[PDB]
Amino acid sequence: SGFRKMAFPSGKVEGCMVQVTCGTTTLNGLWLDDVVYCPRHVICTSEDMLNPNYEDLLIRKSNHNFLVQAGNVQLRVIGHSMQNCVLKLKVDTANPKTPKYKFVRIQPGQTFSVLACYNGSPSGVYQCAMRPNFTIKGSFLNGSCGSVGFNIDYDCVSFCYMHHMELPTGVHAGTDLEGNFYGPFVDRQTAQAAGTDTTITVNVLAWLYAAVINGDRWFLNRFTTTLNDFNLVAMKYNYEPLTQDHVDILGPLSAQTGIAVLDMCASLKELLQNGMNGRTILGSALLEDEFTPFDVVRQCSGVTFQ
Amino acid sequence: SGFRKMAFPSGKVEGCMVQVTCGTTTLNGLWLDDVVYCPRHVICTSEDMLNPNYEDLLIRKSNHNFLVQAGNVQLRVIGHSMQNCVLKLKVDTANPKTPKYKFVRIQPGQTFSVLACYNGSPSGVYQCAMRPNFTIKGSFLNGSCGSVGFNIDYDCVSFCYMHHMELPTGVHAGTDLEGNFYGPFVDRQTAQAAGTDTTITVNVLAWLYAAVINGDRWFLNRFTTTLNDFNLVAMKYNYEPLTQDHVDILGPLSAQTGIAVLDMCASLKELLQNGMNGRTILGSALLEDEFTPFDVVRQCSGVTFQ
Ligand SMILES: [K+]
Ligand SMILES: [K+]
């Protein structure tokens, strides 16, 4: 049946993307009801970016400083405010294509779909994980800022990411839709180090379950382990600790397959210690960690969105 | 920066997906204007599937044998015809969300986005390649049939694939939207072997260029090669021949990077012979072959879709 990096359908988000311009900067905004959300660094000039006082930069701004274009339609800005690192432009028109939505702060490990946009227009869609160091390994270019990450549950878009910057290492950083950065990052052009990145253990386990559902059973072994003994081995290979909450979320998959989580953990332990011996799991020679337990179920069970 | 399996935005295709039921079988249909396209095997019972006479099975069908549901709206079937292996159901309502579209027959190695659907509702979107043996390595479950593959150019959806079946090996086969199978496959439950699958060489090269654009240069070596000497090594590793046309299509990327195609070929030759020495290219320990030269440009240049 197969297994792919599978993104949510993008239709609901496509109709919310607009172009926002201020000064010398154009980037993307999210148009929901009569508000457009975008990164507040759009108000900065190059020189402002080095040490911006945003409260003061925004006071000196007027509604007429902001050009918002939805397709070939100018939206008139009739108000502006700042929530943390997000700019909220109140416009004269509610988006008639506003979907059901919420703003959610995700945790490291968790995944989301990215609708990469330039000039308010979608370029493509791909699946991403919030890395344990609060960066994402996206595919983004100049002008991508304001592009959002999202999950869909039924008909409800949960927006969890807005793109703000690329770090020097070529990885990406941003906020929830309430404007709070994931990670120790600030929207200021000043050197800022990403933490060291670790592997998302719960996701590697989820993917091993995916492999079992798709037939691959060679890595299942006769050994077992305790959670603590597993985490001790994990730590040494730069894997995130496995928590009881992780074990619980892997429940549905353990039930579906009949293999218990601690059994799978022992299977992973061996994989970490010995390697794969030039074998592949779901076409991969590396252990893949950008699929959550929910992602595997959704794909392996055929969950749909309406 | 960054490089991902990036799918086209799915919005334009989402609004064309419907549920088609006949007998006890439910699968997906593509609703364009007042026609719904779906696999004709929807008219077969399990017993019919072993040796179907489609002309005769269809004569014995009436419009009222087909239930089409678009969301919670029943579309009334008022006509039916068969074009090769695709069923065309004429319905009472033109799709108000019909996009600009064409039907295109793609070639092996070319890529496309898949909107996996169940019960006329989208589950997810992912990027696919037409394998050299005319199969696709999709992620599809029971009820996925009628799901389509597509590219977008500007505002125009080019439909290139409709899903019909999974082979025993777990790979997938289907038709263009005129109903002609890609490959030597038939919509009959009778043993059908996929040809031996080879690696899409031009795509591996395109991806190596992507890797260079993103920094990775460790695999660039001091050697060069002729096209023929390359193809001799390629053949031995189950790689498709590299043609002059392939060399020409890689031109833009060779220009962008400054590395000539035959130089990159030599870099690949060594990778094939020695392996990767536990190193990775764009996060991968395997050579990836599901990105075309165009795909790399689009993603690395930031092409957008109206
Ligand atoms: K600016
Ligand atoms: K070389």
Numbering used by the authors:
A (entry chain B), B (entry chain A): 1 to 306
The authors write:
The backbone of compounds SLL11 and SLL12 in the crystal structures assumed an unprecedented semi-cyclic conformation with the N-terminus and C-terminus stacked and possibly forming a T-shaped non-bonded π-π interaction. In this conformation, the N-terminal electrophilic group binds Cys145 close to the S1′ pocket while the C-terminal pyridine group binds in the S1 pocket. This C-terminus to N-terminus orientation is markedly different from the orientation of the natural substrate of Mpro and its substrate-derived inhibitors, which usually have the C-terminal amino acid positioned in the S1 or S1′ position while the remaining peptide chain and N-terminus extend toward the left side of the binding site. This proves that SLL11 was able to outcompete to some degree both X77 (IC50 = 2.8 µM) and GC376 (IC50 = 0.15 µM) used at final concentrations 14 times (20 µM) and 3.6 times (5 µM) higher than the concentration of the protease (~1.4 µM) respectively.
Mpro represents an attractive target for the development of antivirals against SARS-CoV-2 as it is essential for the viral life cycle and structurally conserved among alpha and beta coronaviruses, allowing the development of potent pan-coronavirus protease inhibitors. Here, we report a new class of peptide-like inhibitors of Mpro identified using the commercially available DELopen platform (WuXi AppTec) that provides a library of 4.2 billion compounds (screened by the user) as well as the services necessary for the sequence to structure decoding of binders’ DNA tags.
